[PDB]
Amino acid sequence: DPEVTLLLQCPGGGLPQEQIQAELSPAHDRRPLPGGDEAITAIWETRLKAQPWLFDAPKFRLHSATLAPIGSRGPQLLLRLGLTSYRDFLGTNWSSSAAWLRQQGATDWGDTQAYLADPLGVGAALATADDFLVFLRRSRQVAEAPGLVDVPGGHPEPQDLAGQLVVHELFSSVLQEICDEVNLPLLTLSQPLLLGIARNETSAGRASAEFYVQCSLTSEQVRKHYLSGGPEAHESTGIFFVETQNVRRLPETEMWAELCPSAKGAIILYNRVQGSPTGAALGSPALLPPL
Ligand SMILES: CS(=O)(=O)Nc1ccc(CN)cc1
Ligand SMILES: CS(=O)(=O)Nc1ccc(CN)cc1
Numbered sequence: 001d002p003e004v005t006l007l008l009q010c011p012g013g014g015l016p017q018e019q020i021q022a023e024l025s026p027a028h029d030r031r032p033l034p035g036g037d038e039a040i041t042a043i044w045e046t047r048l049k050a051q052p053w054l055f056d057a058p059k060f061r062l063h064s065a066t067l068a069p070i071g072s073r074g075p076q077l078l079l080r081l082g083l084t085s086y087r088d089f090l091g092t093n094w095s096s097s098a099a100w101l102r103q104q105g106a107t108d109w110g111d112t113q114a115y116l117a118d119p120l121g122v123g124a125a126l127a128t129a130d131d132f133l134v135f136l137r138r139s140r141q142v143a144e145a146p147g148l149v150d151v152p153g154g155h156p157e158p159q160d161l162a163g164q165l166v167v168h169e170l171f172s173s174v175l176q177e178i179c180d181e182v183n184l185p186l187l188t189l190s191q192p193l194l195l196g197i198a199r200n201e202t203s204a205g206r207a208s209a210e211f212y213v214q215c216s217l218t219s220e221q222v223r224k225h226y227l228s229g230g231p232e233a234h235e236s237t238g239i240f241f242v243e244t245q246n247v248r249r250l251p252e253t254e255m256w257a258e259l260c261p262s263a264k265g266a267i268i269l270y271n272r273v274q275g276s277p278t279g280a281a282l283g284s285p286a287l288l289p290p291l
Helices: 038-050 086-091 098-109 163-182 219-227 261-274
Strands: 004-009 020-024 058-067 077-085 121-127 132-137 193-200 206-214 238-243
Touching (some): 004 058, 038 086, 132 163, 163 219
Antiparallel strands (some): 132 238
């Protein structure tokens, strides 16, 4: 699918928190725009003068992610991170001129992303005790991917020797987003495993970390918890479930056309890293039917 590119596929069925290092450095920040950051300031002033209740927030910026040689001991992943903001996102990735900033970045820095905010998103493939994944319908009133299907997630907000605290906030934030939006108790959720990193080509290449989380509740109990919050307890307008059996072929369904690019990323990485068995037993024709 051309609206999603894989930056990273994790080994071993996905990486726990203890196997990831982060390097948070101003060397990983966005570069100042060619004619100056005054362009970002002008877009922000126009937006506030229309919507004065808006506020800025800091974000992590993804620079790059390097996997160790497979089968090695020690830390398996290095995440290179900078800092950005909602304001910088609205003035770059979301700008009408975002494709021009990518061309300029290639020319000036040999890096299509050099002049982009590129805030790091998080998302979950969330599995129930009865083997379904959880999907959410987006409001038709929001600016981004209105009315489309999504998975749980949300752009983490800042605050290996501050590195480990940054990895902790990324893993924490995926569980926190599931509690806030799906209304599940924290104690029903497994520690997340990182499946990979996917890039949204419809948002100038901004990246999301995609995780696997297991819930001890059935689909029926997850639905009850979500609905029991009422319309004000959640940003989404509805919840639904697809058997993990059927997720394998999702790209061939009519649902695929309704999935926002970052949820497409979560499903592709789930299928490659948690699905696609490698051993004789799970690989046998009766358990892995052809076609
Ligand atoms: C309103 S929202 O969709 O919950 N937005 C959001 C989601 C996740 C994080 C992570 N810190 C921050 C903000
Ligand atoms: C392809 S299928 O006929 O929809 N059935 C299927 C799908 C996935 C698995 C792996 N658990 C097993 C069976």
